[PDB]
Amino acid sequence: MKTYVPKQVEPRWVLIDAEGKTLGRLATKIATLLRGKHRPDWTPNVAMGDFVVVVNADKIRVTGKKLEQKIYTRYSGYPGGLKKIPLEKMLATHPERVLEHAVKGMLPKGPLGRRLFKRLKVYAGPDHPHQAQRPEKL
Amino acid sequence: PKGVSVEVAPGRVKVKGPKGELEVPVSPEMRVVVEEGVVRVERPSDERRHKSLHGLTRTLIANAVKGVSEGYSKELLIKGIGYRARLVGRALELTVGFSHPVVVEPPEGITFEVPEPTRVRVSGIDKQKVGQVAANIRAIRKPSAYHEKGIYYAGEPVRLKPGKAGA
Amino acid sequence: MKGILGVKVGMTRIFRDDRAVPVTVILAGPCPVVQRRTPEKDGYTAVQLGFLPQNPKRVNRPLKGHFAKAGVEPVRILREIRDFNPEGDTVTVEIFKPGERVDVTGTSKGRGFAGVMKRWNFAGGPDSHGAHKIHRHPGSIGNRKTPGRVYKGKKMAGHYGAERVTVMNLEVVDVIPEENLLLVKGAVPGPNGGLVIVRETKKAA
Amino acid sequence: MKVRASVKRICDKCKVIRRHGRVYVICENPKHKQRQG
RNA sequence: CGGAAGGGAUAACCGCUGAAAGCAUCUAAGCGGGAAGCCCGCCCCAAGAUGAGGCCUCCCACGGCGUCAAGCCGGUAAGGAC
RNA sequence: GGGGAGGUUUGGCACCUCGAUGUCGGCUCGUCGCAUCCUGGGGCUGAAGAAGGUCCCAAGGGUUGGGCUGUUCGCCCAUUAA
RNA sequence: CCGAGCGCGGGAACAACCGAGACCGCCAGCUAAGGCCCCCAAGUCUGGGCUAAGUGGUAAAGGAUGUGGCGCCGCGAAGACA
């Protein structure tokens, strides 16, 4: 025969917690969902993996000293442009990042790996734009 | 712990006394309850962290009770020469080795009070934040300075030779 | 952190006090306030500020003759003071009093594409001994093989002119309501008869 | 002494207190103010 | 005229209540002081911040092929340009 | 007398390059490093004060101008918080 | 072993470390080395031990009341550590 090709599938939204979950353990799952890898109809080259909006990120938990320890680096092309912000302050200002980040490096990278990150919309809250389905999960 | 006023909560023993009430939040790990007329405390097991926390907390809250039962006896004995302690209105205006008068202000939770300029009295109704400000005055003017002069609690000064040992 | 809009004029030295003072004047004049701003539907706290009346047909359309109060448009249109809520009416000049220090913002005139000496400032060199081929030139830029890249932002041969700067800590000694002028310790940036906003200084608050 | 790799109890009236992360050796006369460093 | 003032977390270090280990401790729970250093305040860029954001106004259909599907074609209205 | 770290010096090796990798100092232009020379702070001192010594943290900013020598290194010079 | 196996898969990338001899096709099954949380294919399997350092994520003589576990010789209900 010849293995099957899902036609234009509908984009199923979801929603996951945040608060209480361990930062990394979360994405691990979350990731998989952004791609079709949970779906019994996954396909590499199409991105039909679930739009994961997330609620109250600001209360993400994580282990050890990572609160203080963990360092979020950023380097402009300008010599000496290396700016390293800690997980700590990173919670305090725009905490949503920390998730989106832990995440954004659990995808692959070719032009769609980033298309998929657009398929993700966390907030520190809860709240979101109640657009549709978004059936809660666990 | 007689006419006290304890109050167990998840992990915070709010205690009222004849003076005021304090809140002393410690880890729920072990066992916090009032029983029979006196408060108790007990570890979950024979474990490093557990053991330590058990002792720590037991005497923490133990003092907490005694604090609102009046545990104040801390006051500084300013030894020197031209070091005078005054108290005008709300502010203690002592004048020590510094070229200017030291402006101290009795804050929220404790009450100072200067008997005579030779020595400042502190009524402290909060065993924690008490030694803090004791140390505050004693570190506003460090004593013993080679021979003498400064701010002592009462601790005997270790000496050190005067106009000598400057080879 | 109040403010005012203004045009530039003068620079002199008025022998006030006893000594002398380089004095730059500005006309704040009838400079409108034509639209406030509020957090939820903005995010800050601000006011738009107009200027000099001569506007007939060449302007038209939205005007903000709408807005809520018309007042027509100047011709030098309007800008924005941040963190400022006025009393309402077209503010003038006497916003500040003779005895205050302030900050002043304006474009730097155009010196365009310039030589690195007259820019950030370099050196060039050898008028004689060495050669003639590198009088007004940068000489070096970066390291041999590693980097092998030319440092991003390495002070280079380029533009230096039509820009903009805010100056801090000046001293407005005079202010005439009768003709709408404001006289400061001469330091004004930009040419005479141009665009410049005055706002209060900063120091310890 | 005072800051060094090797840090003893030297005079009996000293104690080794693993404080703020690293080993110290404190006493009365801070001339033996040792420290693992 | 600019380096400020000041705020927030810190090093080395100095301290407070306090155990395991009746006594001790600046700590393993908690808390305070503390640097030209770190974050900011300050000046400037900057929504090509593909995520193009926000505010204030201003103009408005069927006109010929797409009936249902996104276009396509000729001048217009705010306008903008040569 | 032991143990290390560093990769500047001085050497051992001869793997890229012999159809080329133009070697010194100075000009110009730097940037990084910290085992800090100056400036904060702090510790201890055989530290009265003064100034000094030594050890830890700290690169933000600074690190001058003339004489001799091609000379970097050096000495001198008049200085500087350096 | 390469060279001649820069044909294959691990080894992050790497002629020679590990595994393993390519006549060709296959949208078929096992399995090696490594590996199974997601790269990237498969156990966030099973069960119990150690550690609090990001050790793991590459350094010594040496140093310390770090923490788990083992052993030895007194002290002690005649009464002790403090």
mmCIF file of N, CA and C in Angstrom, chain A residues 15-19 53-58 60 121-128 134:
data_model
loop_
_atom_site.group_PDB
_atom_site.id
_atom_site.type_symbol
_atom_site.label_atom_id
_atom_site.label_comp_id
_atom_site.label_asym_id
_atom_site.label_seq_id
_atom_site.Cartn_x
_atom_site.Cartn_y
_atom_site.Cartn_z
ATOM 1 N N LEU A 15 -5.818 23.646 26.693
ATOM 2 C CA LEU A 15 -5.528 24.579 27.787
ATOM 3 C C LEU A 15 -4.872 23.736 28.863
ATOM 4 N N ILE A 16 -3.759 24.195 29.416
ATOM 5 C CA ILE A 16 -3.210 23.506 30.568
ATOM 6 C C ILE A 16 -3.030 24.485 31.707
ATOM 7 N N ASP A 17 -2.792 23.923 32.882
ATOM 8 C CA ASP A 17 -2.665 24.647 34.127
ATOM 9 C C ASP A 17 -1.552 25.670 34.054
ATOM 10 N N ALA A 18 -0.495 25.366 34.807
ATOM 11 C CA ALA A 18 0.652 26.217 35.128
ATOM 12 C C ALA A 18 1.020 25.993 36.581
ATOM 13 N N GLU A 19 0.348 26.743 37.453
ATOM 14 C CA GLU A 19 0.649 26.751 38.881
ATOM 15 C C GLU A 19 0.798 25.341 39.447
ATOM 16 N N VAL A 53 -2.916 27.267 24.554
ATOM 17 C CA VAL A 53 -2.951 28.476 25.345
ATOM 18 C C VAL A 53 -2.703 28.028 26.775
ATOM 19 N N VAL A 54 -2.026 28.850 27.558
ATOM 20 C CA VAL A 54 -1.733 28.449 28.913
ATOM 21 C C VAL A 54 -2.190 29.521 29.873
ATOM 22 N N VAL A 55 -2.638 29.097 31.042
ATOM 23 C CA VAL A 55 -3.015 30.052 32.048
ATOM 24 C C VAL A 55 -1.936 30.189 33.083
ATOM 25 N N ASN A 56 -2.275 30.941 34.126
ATOM 26 C CA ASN A 56 -1.363 31.477 35.141
ATOM 27 C C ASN A 56 0.088 31.011 35.189
ATOM 28 N N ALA A 57 0.849 31.327 34.145
ATOM 29 C CA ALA A 57 2.258 30.970 34.096
ATOM 30 C C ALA A 57 3.012 31.510 35.307
ATOM 31 N N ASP A 58 2.735 32.760 35.676
ATOM 32 C CA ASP A 58 3.470 33.472 36.738
ATOM 33 C C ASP A 58 3.714 32.679 38.017
ATOM 34 N N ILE A 60 4.546 29.384 37.886
ATOM 35 C CA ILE A 60 5.267 28.173 37.536
ATOM 36 C C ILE A 60 6.192 27.828 38.696
ATOM 37 N N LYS A 121 0.200 30.147 23.157
ATOM 38 C CA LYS A 121 -0.176 31.457 23.680
ATOM 39 C C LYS A 121 -0.421 31.446 25.189
ATOM 40 N N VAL A 122 0.651 31.481 25.963
ATOM 41 C CA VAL A 122 0.541 31.492 27.415
ATOM 42 C C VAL A 122 0.094 32.873 27.899
ATOM 43 N N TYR A 123 -0.393 32.940 29.131
ATOM 44 C CA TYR A 123 -0.535 34.196 29.845
ATOM 45 C C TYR A 123 -0.157 33.945 31.283
ATOM 46 N N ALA A 124 0.240 34.998 31.970
ATOM 47 C CA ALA A 124 0.342 34.938 33.406
ATOM 48 C C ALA A 124 -0.977 35.494 33.878
ATOM 49 N N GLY A 125 -1.747 34.673 34.585
ATOM 50 C CA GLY A 125 -3.121 35.018 34.906
ATOM 51 C C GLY A 125 -3.846 34.207 35.970
ATOM 52 N N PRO A 126 -4.874 33.424 35.587
ATOM 53 C CA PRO A 126 -5.400 32.910 34.306
ATOM 54 C C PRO A 126 -5.750 33.879 33.156
ATOM 55 N N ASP A 127 -7.025 33.895 32.780
ATOM 56 C CA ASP A 127 -7.507 34.664 31.633
ATOM 57 C C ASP A 127 -6.849 34.244 30.318
ATOM 58 N N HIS A 128 -7.497 34.617 29.225
ATOM 59 C CA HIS A 128 -7.047 34.294 27.882
ATOM 60 C C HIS A 128 -8.100 34.893 26.948
ATOM 61 N N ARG A 134 -10.822 24.947 23.662
ATOM 62 C CA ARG A 134 -9.838 25.070 24.697
ATOM 63 C C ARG A 134 -10.343 24.203 25.869
#
